[PDB]
Amino acid sequence: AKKTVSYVCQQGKKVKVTYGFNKQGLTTYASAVINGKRVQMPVNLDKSDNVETFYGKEGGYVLGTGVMDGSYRKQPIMITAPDNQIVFKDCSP
Ligand code: NA
Predict the structure, then answer these.
(1) Distance of alpha carbon 2 from alpha carbon 22, whole angstroms
(2) Contact 87, 6 (CB under 8 A)
(3) Cα 11 from Cα 40, distance rounded (Å)
(4) How many other β-carbons are positioned within 10 Å of the β-carbon of residue 21?
(5) How many whole angstroms separate alpha carbon 3 and alpha carbon 10?
(6) Domain-wise residue ranges, the chain
(7) What is each CA distance from 23 to 28, 30, 48, 66, 89, in whole angstroms?
(8) Which of 9, 18, 26, 59 keeps 20 to 30 A from 42, CA to CA?
(9) Rounded to the nearest whole angstrom, what is the distance from the C-alpha of residue 35 to the centroid of ligand 1?
């Protein structure tokens, strides 16, 4: 099961993100279209905690958000590039 959310961020940047959900109701990935290219970021269970979910791996793009269940449309997000610069900042749905 997929669900898509459109966001507006700092400096007017816009991004659409698609979240995958398994049969347990947990998210498995976040897929963001960045310069026209689909960037799929797998959920990072080692880095996720009671307040924040992270998607992505070292060397790739990394998405950070709140706790995601079928909650997900009310969460803010941020996306950091491989160089560690926050390229989508303070994003709201
Ligand atoms: Na980069």
Answers:
(1) 9
(2) no
(3) 24
(4) 17
(5) 23
(6) 1-93
(7) 10, 16, 20, 20, 31
(8) 9
(9) 13
CA gap 80, 86 in Å, rounded: 4
Residues with CB under 5 A from ligand 1 (ion): 81-83
**Helical (H) or strand (E) element with 18:** strand 14-21
Measured in angstroms, how far is the CA atom of residue 50 from the centroid of ligand 1? 28
| Residues in the chain after which the backbone breaks (C–N beyond 2.5 Å) | 70
Measure 32 CA to ligand 1 centroid, in angstroms.
15
Residue pair 5/14 in contact (Cβ under 8 Å)? The answer is: no
Residue among 1, 7, 15 at smallest CA distance from 70: 1
CB 47 within 8 A of CB 63: no
